Short mmCIF file of C-alpha atoms in Angstrom, two decimals:
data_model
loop_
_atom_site.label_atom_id
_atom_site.label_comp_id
_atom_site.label_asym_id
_atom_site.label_seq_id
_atom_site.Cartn_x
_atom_site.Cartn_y
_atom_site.Cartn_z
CA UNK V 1 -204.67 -11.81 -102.95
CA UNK V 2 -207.23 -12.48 -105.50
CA UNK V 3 -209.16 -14.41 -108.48
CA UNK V 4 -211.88 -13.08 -110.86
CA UNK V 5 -215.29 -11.85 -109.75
CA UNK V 6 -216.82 -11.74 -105.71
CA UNK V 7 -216.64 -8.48 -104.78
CA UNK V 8 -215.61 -5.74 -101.85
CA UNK V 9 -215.92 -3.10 -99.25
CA UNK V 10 -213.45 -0.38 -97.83
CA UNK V 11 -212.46 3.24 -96.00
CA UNK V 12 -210.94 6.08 -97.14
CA UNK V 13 -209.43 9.30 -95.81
CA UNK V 14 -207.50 12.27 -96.28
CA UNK V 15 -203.81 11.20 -94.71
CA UNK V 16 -201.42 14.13 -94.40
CA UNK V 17 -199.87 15.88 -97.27
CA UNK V 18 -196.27 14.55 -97.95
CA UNK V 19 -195.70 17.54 -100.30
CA UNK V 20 -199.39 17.75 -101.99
CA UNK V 21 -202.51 16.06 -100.14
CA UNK V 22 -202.15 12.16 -98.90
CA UNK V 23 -205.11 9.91 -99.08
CA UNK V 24 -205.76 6.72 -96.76
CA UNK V 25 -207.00 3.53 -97.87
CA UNK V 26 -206.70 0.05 -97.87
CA UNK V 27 -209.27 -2.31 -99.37
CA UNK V 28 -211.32 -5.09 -97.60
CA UNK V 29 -213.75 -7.37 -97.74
CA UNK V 30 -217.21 -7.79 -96.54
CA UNK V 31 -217.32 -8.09 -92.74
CA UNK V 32 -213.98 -5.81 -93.47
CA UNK V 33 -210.84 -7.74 -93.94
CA UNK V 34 -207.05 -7.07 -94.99
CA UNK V 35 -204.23 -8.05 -97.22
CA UNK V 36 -202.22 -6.42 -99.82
CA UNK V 37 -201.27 -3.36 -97.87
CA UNK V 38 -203.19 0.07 -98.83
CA UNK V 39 -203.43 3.03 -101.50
CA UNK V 40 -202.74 6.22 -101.37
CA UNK V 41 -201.93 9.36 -104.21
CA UNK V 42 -201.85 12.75 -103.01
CA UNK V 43 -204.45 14.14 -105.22
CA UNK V 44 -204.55 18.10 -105.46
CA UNK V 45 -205.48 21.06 -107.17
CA UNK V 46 -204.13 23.67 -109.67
CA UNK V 47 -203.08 26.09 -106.49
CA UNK V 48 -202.82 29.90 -106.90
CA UNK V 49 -201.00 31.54 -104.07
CA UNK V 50 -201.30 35.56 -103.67
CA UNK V 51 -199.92 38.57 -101.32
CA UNK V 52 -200.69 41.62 -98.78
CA UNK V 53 -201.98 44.90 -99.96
CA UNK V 54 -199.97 47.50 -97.25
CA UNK V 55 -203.31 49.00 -96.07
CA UNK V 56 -204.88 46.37 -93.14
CA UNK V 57 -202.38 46.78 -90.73
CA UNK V 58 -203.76 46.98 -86.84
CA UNK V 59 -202.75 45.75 -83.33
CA UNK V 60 -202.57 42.26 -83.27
CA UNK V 61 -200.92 41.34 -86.72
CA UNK V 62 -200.32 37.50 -86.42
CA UNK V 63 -198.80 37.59 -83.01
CA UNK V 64 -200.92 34.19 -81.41
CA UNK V 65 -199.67 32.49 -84.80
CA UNK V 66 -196.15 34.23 -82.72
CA UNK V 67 -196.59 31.72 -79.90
CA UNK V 68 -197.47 28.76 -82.49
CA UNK V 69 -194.80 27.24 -83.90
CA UNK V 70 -191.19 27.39 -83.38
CA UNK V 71 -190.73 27.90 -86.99
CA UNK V 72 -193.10 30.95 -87.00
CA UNK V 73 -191.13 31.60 -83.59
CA UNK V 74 -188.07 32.09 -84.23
CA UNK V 75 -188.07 33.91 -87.62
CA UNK V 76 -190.17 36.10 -86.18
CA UNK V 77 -187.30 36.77 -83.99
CA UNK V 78 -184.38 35.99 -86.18
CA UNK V 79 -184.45 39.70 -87.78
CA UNK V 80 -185.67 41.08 -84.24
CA UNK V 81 -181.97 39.87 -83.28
CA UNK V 82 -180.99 41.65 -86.02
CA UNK V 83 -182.43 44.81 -85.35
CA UNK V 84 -180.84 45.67 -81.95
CA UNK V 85 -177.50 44.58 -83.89
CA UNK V 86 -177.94 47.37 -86.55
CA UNK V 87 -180.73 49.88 -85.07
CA UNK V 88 -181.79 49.28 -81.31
CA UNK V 89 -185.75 48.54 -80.73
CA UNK V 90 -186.83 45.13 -80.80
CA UNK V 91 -189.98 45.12 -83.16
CA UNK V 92 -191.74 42.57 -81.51
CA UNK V 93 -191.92 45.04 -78.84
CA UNK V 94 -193.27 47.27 -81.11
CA UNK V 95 -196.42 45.42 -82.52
CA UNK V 96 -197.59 43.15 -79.40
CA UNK V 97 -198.01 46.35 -77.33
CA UNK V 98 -198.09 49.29 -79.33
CA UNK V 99 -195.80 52.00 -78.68
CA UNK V 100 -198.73 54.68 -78.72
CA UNK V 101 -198.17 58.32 -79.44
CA UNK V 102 -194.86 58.99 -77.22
CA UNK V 103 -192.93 56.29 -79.28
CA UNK V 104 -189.57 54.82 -78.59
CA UNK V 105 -187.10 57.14 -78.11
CA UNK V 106 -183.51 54.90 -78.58
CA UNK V 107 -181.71 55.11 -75.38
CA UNK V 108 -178.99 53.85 -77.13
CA UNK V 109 -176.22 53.90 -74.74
CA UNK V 110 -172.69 55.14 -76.20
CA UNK V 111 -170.80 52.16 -75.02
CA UNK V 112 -169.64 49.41 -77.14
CA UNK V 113 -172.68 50.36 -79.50
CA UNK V 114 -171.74 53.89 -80.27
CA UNK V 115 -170.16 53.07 -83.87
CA UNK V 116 -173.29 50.34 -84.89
CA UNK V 117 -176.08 52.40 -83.66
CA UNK V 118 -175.33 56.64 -82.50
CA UNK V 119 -173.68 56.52 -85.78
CA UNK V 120 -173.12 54.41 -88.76
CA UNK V 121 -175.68 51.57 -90.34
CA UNK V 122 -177.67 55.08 -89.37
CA UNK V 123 -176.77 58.54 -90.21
CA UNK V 124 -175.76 57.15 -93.96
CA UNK V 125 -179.22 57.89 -95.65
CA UNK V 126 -179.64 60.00 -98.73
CA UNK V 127 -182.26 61.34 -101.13
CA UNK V 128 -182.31 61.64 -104.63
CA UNK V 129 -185.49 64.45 -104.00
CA UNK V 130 -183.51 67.25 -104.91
CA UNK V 131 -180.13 68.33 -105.60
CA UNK V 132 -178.18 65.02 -105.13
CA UNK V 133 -176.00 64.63 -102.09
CA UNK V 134 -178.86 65.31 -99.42
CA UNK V 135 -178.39 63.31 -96.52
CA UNK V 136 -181.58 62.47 -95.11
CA UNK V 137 -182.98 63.85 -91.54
CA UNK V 138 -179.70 65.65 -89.95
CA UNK V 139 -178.93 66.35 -86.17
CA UNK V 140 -177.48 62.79 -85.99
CA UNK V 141 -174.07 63.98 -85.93
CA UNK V 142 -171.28 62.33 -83.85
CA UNK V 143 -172.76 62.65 -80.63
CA UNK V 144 -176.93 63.32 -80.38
CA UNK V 145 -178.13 61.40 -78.07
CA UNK V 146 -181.48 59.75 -78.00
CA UNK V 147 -182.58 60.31 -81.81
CA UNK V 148 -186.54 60.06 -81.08
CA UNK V 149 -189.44 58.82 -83.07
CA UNK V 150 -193.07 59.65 -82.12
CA UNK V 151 -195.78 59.37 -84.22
CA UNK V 152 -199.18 60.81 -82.83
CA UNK V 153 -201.98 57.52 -83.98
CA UNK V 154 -200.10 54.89 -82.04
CA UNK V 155 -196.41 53.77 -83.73
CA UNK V 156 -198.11 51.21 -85.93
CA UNK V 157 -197.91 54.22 -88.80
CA UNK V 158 -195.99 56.48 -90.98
CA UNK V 159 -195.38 53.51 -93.52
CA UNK V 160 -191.81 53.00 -91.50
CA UNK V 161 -192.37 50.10 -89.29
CA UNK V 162 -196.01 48.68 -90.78
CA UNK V 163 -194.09 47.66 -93.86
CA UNK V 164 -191.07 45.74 -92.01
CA UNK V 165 -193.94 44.66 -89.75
CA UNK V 166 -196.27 43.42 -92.21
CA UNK V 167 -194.06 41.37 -94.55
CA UNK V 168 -192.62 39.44 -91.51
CA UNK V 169 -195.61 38.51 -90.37
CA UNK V 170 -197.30 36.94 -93.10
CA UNK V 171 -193.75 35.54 -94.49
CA UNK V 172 -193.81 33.16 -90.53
CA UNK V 173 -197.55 32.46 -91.28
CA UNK V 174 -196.68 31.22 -94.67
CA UNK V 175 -193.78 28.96 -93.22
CA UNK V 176 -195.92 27.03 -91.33
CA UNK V 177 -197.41 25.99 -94.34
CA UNK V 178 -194.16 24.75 -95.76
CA UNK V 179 -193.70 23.25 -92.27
CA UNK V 180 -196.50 20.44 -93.22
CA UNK V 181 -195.67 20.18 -96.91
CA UNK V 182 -198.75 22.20 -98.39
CA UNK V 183 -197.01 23.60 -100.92
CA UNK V 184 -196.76 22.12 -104.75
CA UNK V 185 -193.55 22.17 -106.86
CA UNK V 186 -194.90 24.83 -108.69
CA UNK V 187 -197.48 27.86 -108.46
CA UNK V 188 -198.19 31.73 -108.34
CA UNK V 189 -196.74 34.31 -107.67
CA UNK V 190 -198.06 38.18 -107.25
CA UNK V 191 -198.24 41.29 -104.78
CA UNK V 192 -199.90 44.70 -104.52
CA UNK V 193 -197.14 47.34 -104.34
CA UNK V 194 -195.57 45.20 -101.14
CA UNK V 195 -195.86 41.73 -101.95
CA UNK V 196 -193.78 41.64 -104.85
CA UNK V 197 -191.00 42.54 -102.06
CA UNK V 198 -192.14 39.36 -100.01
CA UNK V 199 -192.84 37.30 -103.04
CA UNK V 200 -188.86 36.26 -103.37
CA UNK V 201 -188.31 36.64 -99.99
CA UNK V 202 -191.37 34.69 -99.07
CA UNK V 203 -191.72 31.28 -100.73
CA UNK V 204 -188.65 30.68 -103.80
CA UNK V 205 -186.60 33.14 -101.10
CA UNK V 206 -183.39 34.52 -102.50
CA UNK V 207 -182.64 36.36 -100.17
CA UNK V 208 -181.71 36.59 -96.01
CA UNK V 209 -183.69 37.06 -93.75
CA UNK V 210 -182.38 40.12 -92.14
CA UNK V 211 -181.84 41.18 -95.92
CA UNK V 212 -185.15 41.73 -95.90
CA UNK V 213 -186.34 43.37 -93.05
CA UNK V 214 -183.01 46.48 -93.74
CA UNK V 215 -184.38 46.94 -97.43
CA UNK V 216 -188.31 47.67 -96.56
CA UNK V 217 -187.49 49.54 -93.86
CA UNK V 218 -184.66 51.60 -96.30
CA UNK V 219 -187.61 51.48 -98.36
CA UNK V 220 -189.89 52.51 -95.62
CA UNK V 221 -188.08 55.45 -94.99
CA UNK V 222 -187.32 56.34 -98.14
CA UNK V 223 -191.07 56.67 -99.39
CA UNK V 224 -191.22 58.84 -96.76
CA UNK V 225 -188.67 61.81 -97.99
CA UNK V 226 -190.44 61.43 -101.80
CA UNK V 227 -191.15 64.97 -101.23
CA UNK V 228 -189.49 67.91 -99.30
CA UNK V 229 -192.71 69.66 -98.06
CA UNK V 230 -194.01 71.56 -94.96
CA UNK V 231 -192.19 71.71 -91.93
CA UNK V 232 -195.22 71.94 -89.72
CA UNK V 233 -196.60 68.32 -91.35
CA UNK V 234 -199.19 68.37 -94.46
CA UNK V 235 -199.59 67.46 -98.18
CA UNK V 236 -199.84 68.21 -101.82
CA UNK V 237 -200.18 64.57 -102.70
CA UNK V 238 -203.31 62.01 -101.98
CA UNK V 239 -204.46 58.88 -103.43
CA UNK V 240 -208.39 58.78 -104.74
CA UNK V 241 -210.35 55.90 -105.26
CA UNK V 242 -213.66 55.84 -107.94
CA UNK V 243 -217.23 54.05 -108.71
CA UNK V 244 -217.78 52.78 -112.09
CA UNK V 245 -218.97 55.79 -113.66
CA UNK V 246 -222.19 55.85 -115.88
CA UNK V 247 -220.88 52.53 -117.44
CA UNK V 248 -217.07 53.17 -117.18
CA UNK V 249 -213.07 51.60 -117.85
CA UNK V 250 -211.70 53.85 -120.16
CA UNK V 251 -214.08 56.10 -120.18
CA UNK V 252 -212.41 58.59 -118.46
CA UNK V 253 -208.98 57.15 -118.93
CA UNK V 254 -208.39 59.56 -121.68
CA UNK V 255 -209.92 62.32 -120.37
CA UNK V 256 -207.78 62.69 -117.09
CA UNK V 257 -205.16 62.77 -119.86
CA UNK V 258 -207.12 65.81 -120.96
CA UNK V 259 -206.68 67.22 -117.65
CA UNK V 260 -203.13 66.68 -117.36
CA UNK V 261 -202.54 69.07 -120.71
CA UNK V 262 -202.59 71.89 -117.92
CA UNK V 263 -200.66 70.24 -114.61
CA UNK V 264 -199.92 67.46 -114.59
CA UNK V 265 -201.01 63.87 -112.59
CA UNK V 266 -201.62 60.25 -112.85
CA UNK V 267 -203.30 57.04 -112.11
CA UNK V 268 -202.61 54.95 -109.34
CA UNK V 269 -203.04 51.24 -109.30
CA UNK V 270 -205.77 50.48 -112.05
CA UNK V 271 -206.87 47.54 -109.55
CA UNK V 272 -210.06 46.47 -111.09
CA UNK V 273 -213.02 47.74 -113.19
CA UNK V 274 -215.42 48.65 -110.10
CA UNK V 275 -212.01 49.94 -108.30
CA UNK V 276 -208.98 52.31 -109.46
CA UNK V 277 -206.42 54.86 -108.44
CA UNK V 278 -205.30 58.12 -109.34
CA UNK V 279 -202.43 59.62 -108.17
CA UNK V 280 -203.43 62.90 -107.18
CA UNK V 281 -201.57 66.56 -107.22
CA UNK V 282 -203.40 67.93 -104.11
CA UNK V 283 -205.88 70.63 -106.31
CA UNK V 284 -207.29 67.56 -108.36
CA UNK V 285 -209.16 66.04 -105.14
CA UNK V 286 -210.86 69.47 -104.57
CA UNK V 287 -210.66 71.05 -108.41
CA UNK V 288 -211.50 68.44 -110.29
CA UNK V 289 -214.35 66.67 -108.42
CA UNK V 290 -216.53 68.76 -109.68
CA UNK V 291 -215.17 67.39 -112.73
CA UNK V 292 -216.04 64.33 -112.49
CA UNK V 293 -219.16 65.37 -110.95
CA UNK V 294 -220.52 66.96 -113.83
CA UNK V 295 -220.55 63.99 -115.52
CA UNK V 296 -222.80 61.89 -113.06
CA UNK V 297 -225.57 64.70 -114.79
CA UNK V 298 -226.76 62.06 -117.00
CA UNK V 299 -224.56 61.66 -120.01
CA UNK V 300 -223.38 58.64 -121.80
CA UNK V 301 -221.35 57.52 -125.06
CA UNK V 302 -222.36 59.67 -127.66
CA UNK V 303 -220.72 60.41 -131.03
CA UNK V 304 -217.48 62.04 -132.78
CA UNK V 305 -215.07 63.75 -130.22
CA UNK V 306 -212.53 66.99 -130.46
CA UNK V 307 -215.62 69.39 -129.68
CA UNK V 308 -214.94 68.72 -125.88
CA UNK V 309 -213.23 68.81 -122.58
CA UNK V 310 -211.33 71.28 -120.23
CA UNK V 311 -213.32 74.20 -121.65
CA UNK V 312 -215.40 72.88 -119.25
CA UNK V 313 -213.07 71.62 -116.16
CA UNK V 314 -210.73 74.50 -115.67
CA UNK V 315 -213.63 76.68 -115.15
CA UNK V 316 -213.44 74.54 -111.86
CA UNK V 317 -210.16 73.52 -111.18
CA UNK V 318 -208.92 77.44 -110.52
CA UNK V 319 -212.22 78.20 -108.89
CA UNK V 320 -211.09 76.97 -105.06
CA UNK V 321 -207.38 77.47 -105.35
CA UNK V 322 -208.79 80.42 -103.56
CA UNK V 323 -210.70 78.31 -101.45
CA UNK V 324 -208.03 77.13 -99.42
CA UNK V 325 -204.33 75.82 -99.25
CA UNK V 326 -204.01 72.07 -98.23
CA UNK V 327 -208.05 71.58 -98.92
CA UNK V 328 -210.08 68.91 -97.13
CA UNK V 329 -211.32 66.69 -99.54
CA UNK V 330 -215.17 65.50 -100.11
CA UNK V 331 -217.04 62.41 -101.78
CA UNK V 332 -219.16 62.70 -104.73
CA UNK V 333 -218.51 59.99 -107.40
CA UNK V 334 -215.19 60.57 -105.65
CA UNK V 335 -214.04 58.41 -102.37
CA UNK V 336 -210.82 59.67 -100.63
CA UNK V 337 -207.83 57.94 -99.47
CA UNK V 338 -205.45 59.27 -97.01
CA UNK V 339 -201.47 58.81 -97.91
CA UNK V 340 -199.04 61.54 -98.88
CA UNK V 341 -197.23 60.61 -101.60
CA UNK V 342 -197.18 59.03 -105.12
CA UNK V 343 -196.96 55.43 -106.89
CA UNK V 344 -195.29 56.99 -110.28
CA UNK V 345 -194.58 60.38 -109.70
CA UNK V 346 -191.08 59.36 -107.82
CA UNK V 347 -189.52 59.54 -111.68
CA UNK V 348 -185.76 60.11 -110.61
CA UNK V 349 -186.30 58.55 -107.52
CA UNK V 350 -184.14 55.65 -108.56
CA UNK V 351 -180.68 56.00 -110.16
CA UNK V 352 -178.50 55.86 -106.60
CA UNK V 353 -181.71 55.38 -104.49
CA UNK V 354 -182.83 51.84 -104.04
CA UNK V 355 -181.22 51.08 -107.44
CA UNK V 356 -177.86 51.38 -105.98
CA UNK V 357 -178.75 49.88 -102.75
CA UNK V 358 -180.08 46.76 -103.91
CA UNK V 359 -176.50 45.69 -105.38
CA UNK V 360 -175.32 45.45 -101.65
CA UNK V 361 -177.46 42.82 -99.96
CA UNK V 362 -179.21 40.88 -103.20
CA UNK V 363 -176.03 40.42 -105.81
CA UNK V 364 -175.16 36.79 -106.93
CA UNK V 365 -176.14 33.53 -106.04
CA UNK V 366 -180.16 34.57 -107.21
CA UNK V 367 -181.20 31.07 -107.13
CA UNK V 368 -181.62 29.28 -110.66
CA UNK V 369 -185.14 29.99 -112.63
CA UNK V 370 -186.99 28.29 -110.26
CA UNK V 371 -188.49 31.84 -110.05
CA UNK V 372 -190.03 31.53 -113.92
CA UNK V 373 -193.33 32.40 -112.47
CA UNK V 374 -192.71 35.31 -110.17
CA UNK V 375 -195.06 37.45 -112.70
CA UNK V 376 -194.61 40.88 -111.07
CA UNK V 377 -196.27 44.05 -111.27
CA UNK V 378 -196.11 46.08 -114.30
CA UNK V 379 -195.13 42.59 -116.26
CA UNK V 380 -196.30 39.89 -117.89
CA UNK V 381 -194.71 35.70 -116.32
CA UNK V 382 -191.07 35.55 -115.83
CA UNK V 383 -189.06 34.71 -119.21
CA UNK V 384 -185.64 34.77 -119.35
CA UNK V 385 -185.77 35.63 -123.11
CA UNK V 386 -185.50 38.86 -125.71
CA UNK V 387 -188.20 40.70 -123.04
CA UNK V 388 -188.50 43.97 -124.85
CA UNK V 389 -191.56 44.84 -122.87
CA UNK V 390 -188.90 45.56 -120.07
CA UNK V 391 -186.92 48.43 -122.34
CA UNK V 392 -190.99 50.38 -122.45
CA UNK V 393 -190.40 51.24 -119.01
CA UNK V 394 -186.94 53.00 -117.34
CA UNK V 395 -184.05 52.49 -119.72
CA UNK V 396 -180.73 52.66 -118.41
CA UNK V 397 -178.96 49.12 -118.54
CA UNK V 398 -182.10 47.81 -120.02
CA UNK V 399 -180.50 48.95 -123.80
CA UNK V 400 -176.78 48.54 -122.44
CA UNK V 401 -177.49 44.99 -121.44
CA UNK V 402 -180.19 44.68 -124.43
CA UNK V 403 -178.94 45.00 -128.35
CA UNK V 404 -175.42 45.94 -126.90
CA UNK V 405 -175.72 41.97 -125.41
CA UNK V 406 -178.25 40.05 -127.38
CA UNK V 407 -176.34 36.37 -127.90
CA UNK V 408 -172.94 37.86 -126.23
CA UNK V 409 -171.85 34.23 -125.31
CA UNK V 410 -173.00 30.93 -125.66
CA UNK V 411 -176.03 31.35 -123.69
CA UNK V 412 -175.33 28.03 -120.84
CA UNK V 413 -176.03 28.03 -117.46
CA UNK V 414 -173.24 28.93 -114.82
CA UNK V 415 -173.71 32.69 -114.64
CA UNK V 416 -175.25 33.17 -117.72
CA UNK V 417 -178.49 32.15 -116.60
CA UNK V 418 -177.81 33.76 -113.72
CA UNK V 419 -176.07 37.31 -114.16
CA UNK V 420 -178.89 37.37 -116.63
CA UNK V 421 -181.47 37.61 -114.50
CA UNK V 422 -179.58 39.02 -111.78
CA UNK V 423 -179.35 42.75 -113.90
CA UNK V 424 -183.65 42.54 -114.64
CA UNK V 425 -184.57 41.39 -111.32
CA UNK V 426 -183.18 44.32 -109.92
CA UNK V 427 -184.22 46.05 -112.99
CA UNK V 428 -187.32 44.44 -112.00
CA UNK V 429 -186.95 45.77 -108.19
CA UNK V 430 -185.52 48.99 -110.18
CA UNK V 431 -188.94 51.43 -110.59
CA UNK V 432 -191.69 49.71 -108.67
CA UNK V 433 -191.29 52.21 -106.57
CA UNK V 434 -192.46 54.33 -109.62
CA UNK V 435 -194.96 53.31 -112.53
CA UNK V 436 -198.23 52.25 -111.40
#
C-alpha cells in the first residue's frame, strides 16, 4: 500500500532460474516491513554455448559427475544397456577402470546371443577405401570365438571408444544443466570435428540416445580403415601444427599450394591465426620443414611474385626420402601432432559410407527449425533458404534437390519444412568427415 513521497529500504537476491536466472525481492520499509508481495525478473545474458575438441581425453572423464545426478545417471547408462544388446562390453566399465594394454577380449558366449553379437549388428562393416565391396576386418565368420581388442597405451585410444566415450560424457554433464533450467530459448551452437555430432544430439536432440552412441562408434571405426596401410602398424599420414610465421595468415597459404603442384596435401583445421593445421602426406613433416625453415632466415613481404618457390623446396623435399621410410618427425617453426589419418583427404569416403548409413537411424521426424542456429563447420547459421554455398562443396543431391527443386511445391510446413532439411542435414553430416 502506498501514497506519495516517505521513502524505503529492502533485500535482494539471486532466486533460482525458472528457465533464465530468478531474482528475490520484496520491498520494505525502514525498520524492514512487508506488504504487497515481492519482485522478481529473471534477468540474463546473451549466452553462447560451445563443444569438445576429440583430443583431452584421460582416465577420469566426468565419472564423479557419474554418481551425481540421476539424470546424468542413468543416460550415462541408458546406451551402456544398449551396448551389451548390440556389441557386449559395458563402457562404463571401460572408462572408470581402464582396460590397460590386454583389453577386453568379448567372451561373448554363443547362447541366445550368437545372432546379436558372434555375428550380425557386427561382421556387416564395409569400406569405401578401395575397390567397393570390402568388408571391413575379416576372421569374424560364423563361428570365431572371442574377437579381441587390445590396444598397447591403455584402451582409452585408437579413436574407437574415446569418441563414443567423450560425447556421452559431456552430453550427461550438459543435462544437468537443463535439469535446473539454465538454458535460454535460444543460443549457439558449434563443435570442433566432434561436436557438431553432439551438437543435435546434445541440446535441440533429434536423435536417440543409443542412435548416437552406434553412429560415432561406426564412425569411430570407420576413421580408422581411411587407409589400407602396413600390416605391422605405422603411417604415411600426420597432422602438424604451426607458429605465426614472421608476421603470418596467408602468408604461406598459397605457397603450400605451391608445394602441392608436385604431390599433393592439405590443410587441416585453419583454427586460429596463432594456430592451424595441415594435413600432412608423411614426406611433408620431414621434407618440407626445412621448407618452412628457410623462411624463419629473416625474410618478410617484399615485392612482385612469379620469380619464386619450389626451385627452392624440392631441393629438400627428395633429399631424405633416402633418409628413411616412416621418418620421425622434428620441431623447428614446425610442432608435431600424432594421428594417422586425414580431415579432407577421405574424398570418396562418403557415397555408401556414413552417407548411406545415416538414412537408417536419423530419417524423419528431424524436429521443426528449432535448429536455425546449429551453424556447423564448413558453414555459415542455419537457413532453410536458396543455400548455394552448400552446392561449393560435394555435389550429388545438392544439384538434384537444388535447380531440379527450387519452388517444387507450395513451400508450407508438414514435410516441406521438414524433408527439406532432412536431405542437407545429412548433406550437412554428408563430408565432415572430409573438407577441413
Amino acid at each position: 500500500v502506498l501514497p506519495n513521497t516517505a521513502l524505503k529500504t529492502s533485500i535482494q537476491h539471486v532466486g533460482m532460474i525458472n528457465g533464465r536466472k530468478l531474482i528475490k525481492f520484496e520491498t520494505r520499509n525502514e525498520d524492514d516491513v512487508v506488504v504487497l508481495t515481492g519482485e522478481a525478473e529473471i534477468e540474463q545474458p546473451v549466452t553462447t554455448f560451445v563443444f569438445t575438441g576429440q583430443g583431452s581425453q584421460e582416465q577420469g572423464m566426468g565419472m564423479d559427475l557419474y554418481k551425481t545426478s540421476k539424470a546424468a545417471q542413468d543416460v550415462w547408462n541408458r546406451a551402456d544397456n544398449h551396448f551389451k544388446d548390440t556389441y557386449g562390453f559395458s563402457i562404463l566399465d571401460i572408462v572408470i577402470n581402464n582396460p590397460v594394454n590386454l583389453t577386453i577380449h568379448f567372451g561373448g558366449e554363443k547362447g541366445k546371443r550368437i545372432r546379436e553379437n558372434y555375428s550380425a549388428m557386427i561382421f556387416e562393416t564395409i569400406v569405401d577405401g578401395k575397390l567397393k565391396t570390402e568388408k571391413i576386418f575379416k576372421e569374424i565368420n560364423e563361428h570365431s570365438t572371442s574377437y579381441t581388442f587390445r590396444s598397447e597405451k591403455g584402451l582409452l585410444s585408437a579413436t574407437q571408444f574415446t569418441q563414443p566415450a567423450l560425447t556421452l560424457m559431456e552430453k550427461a554433464a550438459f543435462e544437468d544443466l537443463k535439469s535446473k533450467g539454465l538454458i535460454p530459448a535460444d543460443a549457439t551452437f558449434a563443435g570442433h570435428s566432434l561436436g557438431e555430432y553432439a551438437a543435435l544430439a546434445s541440446l535441440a536432440d533429434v536423435m536417440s540416445i543409443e542412435s548416437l552412441v552406434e553412429v560415432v562408434f561406426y564412425r569411430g571405426m570407420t576413421m580408422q580403415v581411411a587407409v589400407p596401410r602396413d600390416e605391422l602398424g605405422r603411417s604415411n599420414y600426420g597432422m602438424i601444427a604451426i607458429n605465426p610465421g614472421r608476421v603470418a595468415a596467408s602468408f604461406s597459404q598459397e605457397a603450400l599450394q605451391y608445394v602441392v603442384e608436385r604431390v599433393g596435401k592439405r590443410t587441416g583445421w585453419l583454427v586460429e591465426i596463432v594456430n592451424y593445421n595441415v594435413e600432412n602426406q608423411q614426406y611433408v613433416a620431414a621434407g618440407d620443414l626445412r621448407a618452412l625453415d628457410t623462411v624463419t632466415n629473416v625474410l618478410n613481404f617484399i615485392k612482385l611474385q612469379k620469380i619464386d618457390i619450389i626451385e627452392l623446396q624440392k631441393s629438400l623435399s627428395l633429399e631424405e626420402v633416402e633418409g628413411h621410410l616412416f621418418e620421425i618427425i622434428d620441431e623447428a617453426s614446425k610442432k608435431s601432432a600424432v594421428k594417422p589419418r586425414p580431415l579432407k583427404l577421405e574424398r570418396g569416403f562418403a557415397c555408401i559410407p556414413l552417407v548411406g548409413i545415416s538414412v537408417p537411424f536419423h530419417s524423419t521426424y528431424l524436429m521443426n527449425g528449432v535448429k536455425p542456429f546449429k551453424s556447423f563447420l564448413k558453414k555459415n547459421i542455419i537457413k532453410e533458404n536458396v543455400k548455394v554455398a552448400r552446392l561449393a562443396g560435394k555435389y550429388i543431391p545438392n544439384l538434384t534437390a537444388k535447380p531440379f527443386q527450387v519452388t517444387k511445391e507450395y513451400f508450407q510446413d508438414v514435410y516441406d519444412l521438414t524433408g527439406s532439411e532432412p536431405i542437407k542435414e545429412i548433406i550437412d553430416n554428408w563430408e565432415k568427415y572430409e573438407q577441413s
